């Protein structure tokens, strides 16, 4: 639910490294 400080329109979340995932063009964790 919280933004990880990275967007993800065409490129995936580098913040997957800290457990974030792309939702609504934004990288989020819970």
UniProtKB/Swiss-Prot annotation:
This is a cyclic peptide. There is a cross-link at residues 1-30 (Cyclopeptide (Gly-Asn)). Pfam families: Cyclotide. GO terms for biological process: cytolysis in another organism; defense response; hemolysis in another organism. Keywords: Disulfide bond, Knottin, Plant defense. SUPFAM superfamilies: Cyclotides (SSF57038). The keyword Methyltransferase does not apply. Detected in stems (at protein level). Disulfide bonds join 4-20, 8-22, 13-27. InterPro entries: Cyclotide (IPR005535), Cyclotide_bracelet_CS (IPR012323), Cyclotide_sf (IPR036146). Belongs to the cyclotide family. Bracelet subfamily. Probably participates in a plant defense mechanism. Has strong cytotoxic activity against HUVEC cells (LC(50)= 0.58 uM) and various cancer cells including HeLa (LC(50)= 0.48 uM), MCF-7 and K562. Also displays some hemolytic activity. Binds to and induces leakage in phospholipd membranes, particularly ones containing 1-palmitoyl-2-oleophosphatidylethanolamine (POPE). The presence of a 'disulfide through disulfide knot' structurally defines this protein as a knottin. This is Cyclotide hyen-D. It comes from Pigea enneasperma (Spade flower).
């Amino acid at each position: 639910g919280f933004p990880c400080g990275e967007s993800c329109v065409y490129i995936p979340c580098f913040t997957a490294a800290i457990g974030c995932s792309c939702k609504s063009k934004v990288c989020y964790k819970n």
